[PDB]
Design a protein around this nucleic acid. Structure first.
Ligand SMILES: O=C1COc2ccc(N3C[C@H](CCNC[C@H]4Cc5cccc(Cl)c5C4)OC3=O)nc2N1
Ligand SMILES: [Cl-]
Ligand SMILES: [Cl-]
Ligand SMILES: [Cl-]
Ligand SMILES: [Mn+2]
Ligand SMILES: [Mn+2]
Ligand SMILES: [Mn+2]
Lengths: 670, 671
DNA sequence: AGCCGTAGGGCCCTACGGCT
DNA sequence: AGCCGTAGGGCCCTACGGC
């Protein structure tokens, strides 16, 4: 909805395009309303390079810009009717605002190309460090970005019409592989030429989606939003032994500290982590309505509560023992983990699916006993083959159970990273009395919506697209579990109906495996052994660093305790020394001198409470020291022999297998 | 919408009504889907005692119920066509769920009475402690509420049709005064008869809105949502000196801790406190788009940042010195203040508007300097008249400045608590060249939406209801301020046009004063002096309790200093005593009997660190003891003489006036 | 009239890749 | 063709009282 300017001389009038009304309100308050109109849009606009033509012309946003510009489109473009001589793209200073700019330019170039050639399209430059313009105060948006006296608008120029053509089709067109080859050749881990602006802005968007949004890290199997939710729960001590915490608090916590994005993305990613039909090993324990297999969303975040599951403690275990590198957060006010310790193989256990740019990923979940057995075998034989690994890891193990048809799709996916896996419901034919039968479905394929699949069966029966079905009911319940009943007409073959259902409904569904994950911060198609080799290497690194951290801290503490033991052994001299010093600093110097102490030891002596001089407190000091010396010698044994450290890796993985390993759910049928 | 059950036999089928899809999901997952259908609604349902039939019949929620029930309505009702023989009202277990229940009952009583008389209407009893059914797990909603083996449904009974009629008309009808009377007459601060159910659930709703939602407390000027926000900022140290904090963290924090309601009510309440066109003395310091006078909303909470203003530190000043009573929060997991110390008279300074039940409140804002001089005059003269307080407090002072026409409406509002005050835009007539003129408006009345005012004027011009306006523009800008231009046709009398605009548009707007506030937890219409009296009596209690807290605290400390003095004087024997003690208890027991020490004194000695034995601490400890003793008598002098306590209140008020007092913005012109 | 301000409640558009 | 899941972006109904 346009906020027009009062002047009607197009030569001096500017229209700014902003992402929405949050951004529009700061822009309206700061503008010069005589000459500066504002059109807030609605986020991502239609990609006209990919869209059917009738659909573009019906698009509400497309239509409001055409109307606003007054020019018309395509053949009917009349540049003499433009209502503004500066069209100013002013999206947010983040990667999504870069994307929206590339979509806006695609539309101008494909439908209002003379606007560009006439020098009418500009790119505003609002400062970085604000999530959107709505975060800026009006006078700041004026002085930095909109005031003609200070701003630095870039004018879009079209130099090479053929290169611009090709550019728009490669970046914005539907041939993914040309977009993908552009990203790989260019990935890096005033006036403005449109080709160049399109390239740099789309690459800026595409790389961010690839390494910091849609794909999981090979080491902990997490995407950034999930890693930040799980770190946020741990920062707040939201452990299984504590009471549930309001989901609104959690989301608001994670958004402000670590994840500068919309609340629905954070909340709905936390939700998936609590759903036992989505996560093979759920990472979040939800209290309340957390959605169903029928596609119902969760309850609004003001109602639900959450904490960590017990297995999530294994993801976070030893995160504060210098086991993983922390990084600066998005605004330099917080620290966050680049990766979680991940003391079970979470990428394969829970799987992943993510639509990135130029590529996607689709990793099925696995049984945790089999995975760790697989890692165990790899650790005892670096040259193990994929086939040997499949003796441990039979194939996927979906939270929703069901059946897998055959093994060659599994084997291809594990050997190459790509493969097609036919999944089936668990369905039986059974008698219902009076000579009649029914088909009874008790498990359905992974990621299939049950209500949607039932409606698809009702549509087929209604439209006479399948014969033999008299009735269709969902009898699922907490007491029953999943139970879908399809009653068969008397004397009709119910095996033929079922096989037809497998052909015409999601009762059979394929899972296309496409195992892409971040390896060393780069997207990579990996096979099964590589995924396990990267995980095992992470675990050797974590436990080595935890050992190195534990040894430093123990030695420091022992060093302190040696000072307290000296003080307990010479308590009268300690008192005399301190009492005869004017100041704490003279005391600290004199203690260092008399008793050969370090500064840290002297300050520990000065900080000791008189209660530490009682009998049982002196014994406590001696006991902690003796215990610490034994602990130090054990830690040093581990760092001195790579084999002992590798054996500690296997032992802690075996402990996790025994505590959290469960039975396989999906049956793999020959 | 409707998740129907599979049985088509009505006598065994039940339909549960819940507030929405969040509640519906838990209900749908817990139900027995053979006999239990579910219809989520959309929150507050239409009050059909107040609405006419055309609106009712086209309301989406009402239609869905009628279709689902199958019986038709009114004279078309047919009990034989009921698709269920149990209609179960299962709203959330909170006062707004009680309200929705009264609304649904009203609809059944007025359109489907034979359903009640057949005993087909029931009330479910989900357990308390959940914000909505969407917080329960599926299985616990089944076992507590839906399972026929353990549930306690209430069958709605109609026992006297004359009493029911009158009850529905009184509680839900148009006339407000009968509703207000029922609340006043009744407020206290497995089958169910419908009149009892309607009176109980409605009174619960009404009392909760009256005393814990829409009306300000007379002492600190705040409604519960605003108090909890501001307390929330203070408990997280979001002070003016610290950086801004993310609005979403604040809102999520306040909702979990103290305010179990929608995030839109929390965020919008914080937003208004940050608007210098809404608050005469803004309590929240906002970062980003916090809305405008055109009725633009604030940026969404994921974009904005907030902290306290400096004047808000005065609302919170002394909150940690036992000056106000803390209470348990909604779930018993937290403590929250019942009232803030409010070291400036914030009820009148910032005003309030609120719609409650059976009553509303409209308090206009005032100039801080005038208010405090008012309170000061009062404190010197309990018998002071309203005319004399108006020598200090001339009338409201809107953040939007503007003009007030005359004093008679102000005077009536201050004497009785009610009165109409005419607000006028600041408007001049000026030349624009070529012999033509214009009207220029630079200030609009309080709470008038500028863009809406402009389009009303434009509407009068295009509908030829006002002569002589040729053009109209909004030239407002950050550099210019508010500036609306109205061009006048050449030769037209721009003063006639102006006067017509005051008549026909919000350019002139009334403020209807209705000073209702909470006095001792009860709503009360109060005049200006009573409002000032209650505030001053608050300031006396706060300063007296603060003084008593510092006295208690200073005496505990001097006591500790006396025990440490003794230790430092016998430090060798203190150390030995301790060293030969196996446990801290034996040490405690020994120190007390040897040096005549209390438990806390001997605990302080055992807690003392070694660095405290340096040779100037004894004098440093003696130094603090003798100032503390000077400090204890200063405090005791205040508590011994009420005139001194009163003078201390005046002194701290005068200093607040000097630091935050500012000039009057609204001009009162005579009438 | 419809607006003030705390409350109850929810829906739909867009991009992106790969499988059907 | 339209589904999967992280992302960008917003709008409407209801109660309540006084004018
Ligand atoms: O308690 C907390 C904690 O952390 C938070 C972070 C962030 C946000 N939020 C919420 C809000 C966006 C969600 N509602 C948008 C409405 C627009 C619209 C239009 C038509 C139909 C519908 Cl249904 C809707 C829904 O914007 C924002 O930033 N809230 C919270 N709350
Ligand atoms: Cl300590
Ligand atoms: Cl304090
Ligand atoms: Cl208005
Ligand atoms: Mn944005
Ligand atoms: Mn509710
Ligand atoms: Mn008027």
């Amino acid at each position: 909805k346009l906020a027009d300017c009062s002047s009607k001389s197009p030569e001096e009038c500017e229209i700014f395009l902003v992402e929405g009304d949050s951004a529009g309100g700061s822009t309206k308050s700061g503008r010069d309303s005589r000459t500066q109109a504002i059109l807030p849009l609605r986020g991502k606009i239609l990609n006209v390079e990919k869209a059917r033509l009738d659909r573009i012309l019906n698009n509400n946003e497309i239509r409001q810009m055409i109307t606003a510009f007054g020019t018309g489109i395509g053949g009917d473009f009349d540049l003499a009717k433009a209502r503004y001589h500066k069209i100013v793209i002013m999206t947010d200073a983040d990667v999504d605002g870069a994307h929206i700019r590339t979509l806006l330019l695609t539309f101008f170039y494909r439908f209002m190309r003379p606007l560009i050639e006439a020098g009418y399209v500009y790119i505003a430059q609002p400062p970085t460090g604000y999530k959107g313009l709505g975060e800026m105060n009006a006078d700041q948006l004026w002085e930095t970005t909109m005031n003609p006296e200070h701003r630095a608008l870039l004018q879009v120029k079209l130099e090479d019409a053929i290169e611009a053509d090709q550019t728009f089709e490669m970046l914005m067109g539907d041939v993914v592989e040309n977009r993908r080859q552009f990203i790989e050749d260019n990935a890096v881990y005033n006036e403005r030429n449109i080709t160049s602006e399109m390239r740099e802005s789309f690459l800026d968007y595409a790389m961010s989606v690839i390494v910091a949004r849609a794909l999981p890290d090979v080491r902990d199997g997490l995407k950034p939003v999930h890693r930040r939710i799980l770190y946020g729960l741990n920062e707040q001590g939201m452990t299984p032994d504590k009471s549930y915490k309001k989901s609104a608090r959690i989301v608001g916590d994670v958004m402000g500290k670590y994840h500068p994005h919309g609340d629905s993305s954070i909340y709905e990613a936390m939700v998936r982590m609590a759903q036992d039909f989505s996560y093979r090993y759920p990472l979040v324990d939800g209290q309340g309505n957390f959605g169903s297999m029928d596609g119902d969303g969760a309850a609004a975040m003001r109602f639900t509560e959450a904490r960590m599951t017990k297995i999530t403690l294994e993801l976070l275990r030893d995160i504060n023992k210098d086991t993983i590198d922390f990084i600066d957060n998005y605004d330099g006010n917080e620290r966050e983990p680049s990766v979680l310790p991940a003391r079970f193989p979470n990428l394969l256990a829970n799987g992943a699916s993510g639509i990135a740019v130029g590529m996607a990923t689709n990793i099925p979940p696995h049984n945790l006993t089999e995975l760790i057995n697989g890692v165990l075998s790899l650790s005892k034989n670096p040259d193990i083959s994929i086939a040997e690994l499949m003796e441990d890891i039979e194939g996927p193990d979906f939270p929703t159970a069901g059946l897998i048809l055959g093994k060659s799709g599994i084997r291809r996916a594990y050997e190459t990273g790509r493969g097609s896996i036919q999944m089936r419901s668990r369905a039986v034919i059974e008698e219902r009395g009076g000579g009649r039968q029914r088909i009874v479905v008790t498990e359905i394929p992974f990621q299939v919506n049950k209500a949607r699949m039932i409606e698809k069966i009702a549509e087929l029966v209604r439209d006479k697209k399948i014969d033999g079905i008299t009735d269709l009911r969902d009898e699922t319940s907490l007491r029953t579990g999943v139970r879908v009943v399809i009653d068969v007409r008397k004397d009709a073959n119910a095996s033929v109906i079922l096989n037809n259902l497998y052909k015409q409904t999601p009762l059979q569904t394929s899972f296309g495996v496409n195992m892409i994950a971040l390896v060393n911060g780069r997207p990579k198609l990996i096979n099964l052994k590589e995924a396990l080799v990267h995980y095992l290497e992470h675990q050797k690194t974590v436990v080595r660093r935890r050992t190195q951290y534990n040894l430093r801290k123990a030695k420091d503490r022992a060093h302190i305790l040696e000072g307290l033991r000296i003080a307990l052994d010479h308590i009268d001299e300690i008192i005399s020394t301190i009492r005869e010093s004017d100041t704490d600093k003279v005391a600290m110097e004199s203690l260092q001198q008399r008793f050969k102490l370090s500064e840290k030891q002297a300050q520990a002596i000065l900080d000791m409470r008189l209660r530490r001089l009682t009998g049982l407190e002196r014994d406590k000091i001696e006991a902690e020291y003796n215990e610490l010396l034994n602990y130090i010698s054990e830690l040093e044994t581990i760092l001195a022999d790579e084999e002992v450290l590798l054996q500690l890796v296997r032992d802690e993985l075996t402990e996790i297998r025994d505590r959290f390993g469960d039975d396989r759910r999906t049956e793999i049928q020959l």
